[PDB]
């Protein structure tokens, strides 16, 4: 913040709900709690300029957890190949994936 | 002001009632034994799981079994 009134006075008007890893009602952690925590603890201390290069792995994991682009790519590719193989006639959907399974408790 | 209050009581009873009820809404919570118990009850209600904590051998108060005497007791809620 431009003027650090809150840090100066020791109060926390709005600094406690900045990210997904902050305290949630009834201790229900948000999606990607672990990833965000890792990224932020990695990036503490070192400046932003250094973090942008030295916490990149953590940030990449975090964005993957939150948006999930690569997961969508992977599932799309798997189901695309499934469709191609099925149209060719070289694959069958197993019983458990088809609709009849031995349902587990 | 006895005169103005007495007149208000008859000519604008609605506002007299509203202001009186608002005043009571503020006054009573401070003046009441039971107020402390609301937060205790809401803390008693167990929405989430009680997470066990590993016994390092030097934790003397937290019990080992739920039926052990040690630990918080809701007798106060039972006979509030």
């Amino acid at each position: 913040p431009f003027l650090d009134i809150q840090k100066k006075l020791g109060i926390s008007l709005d600094r406690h709900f900045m990210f997904l890893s902050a305290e949630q009602p009834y201790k229900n952690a948000a999606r990607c709690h672990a990833f965000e925590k890792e990224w932020i603890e990695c990036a503490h201390g070192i400046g932003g300029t250094r973090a942008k290069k030295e916490c990149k792995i953590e940030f990449d994991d975090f964005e993957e957890c939150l948006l999930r682009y690569k997961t969508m790519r992977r599932m799309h590719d798997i189901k695309k190949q499934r469709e191609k193989l099925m149209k060719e006639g070289k694959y069958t959907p197993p019983p458990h994936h088809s609709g009849r399974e031995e349902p587990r408790p | 002001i006895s005169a103005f209050l007495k007149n208000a009581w008859a000519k604008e009873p609605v506002l007299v009632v509203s202001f009186s009820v608002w005043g009571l809404a503020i006054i009573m919570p401070m003046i009441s034994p039971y107020t402390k118990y609301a937060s205790m009850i809401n803390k008693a209600t167990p929405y989430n799981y009680p997470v066990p904590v590993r016994d390092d051998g030097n934790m003397p108060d937290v019990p080992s079994h739920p039926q052990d005497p040690l630990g918080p007791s809701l007798d106060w809620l039972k006979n509030l």
Partner: protein
């Protein structure tokens, strides 16, 4: 990057309760009393490891304890328990307040016999 390490279908096999939600509710309180150490060890495993693949051996002990508990009930207090959880199942939200008498019967039966 690395191949995930899912456990095999064989090691994800264990004898399972196969008893309905009403039954579990009716048996909950005594099942929370007895079978405490086992469940609590498994729960600590879950929370400490954070990896579901690393607590399977303890979860199966949880299942075994549940089976033992229910086998004991079936052996001794079976009929009162059936009455109790029938009455519970009938209720819309499986509320205890509706079946207290049958609850008293079951509780007395277990207290004396077991």
């Amino acid at each position: 990057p690395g191949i995930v390490e899912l456990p095999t279908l064989e090691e994800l096999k264990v004898e399972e309760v196969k008893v309905s939600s009403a039954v579990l509710k009716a048996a909950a309180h005594h099942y929370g009393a007895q079978c405490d150490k086992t469940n609590k060890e498994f729960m600590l495993c879950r929370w400490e490891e954070k990896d579901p693949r690393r607590c399977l051996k303890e979860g199966k002990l949880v299942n075994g304890c549940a089976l033992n508990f229910f086998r004991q009930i079936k052996s001794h207090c079976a009929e009162p328990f059936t009455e109790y959880w029938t009455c519970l199942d009938y209720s819309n939200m499986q509320l205890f307040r509706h079946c207290r008498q049958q609850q008293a019967k079951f509780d007395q039966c277990v207290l004396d016999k077991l």
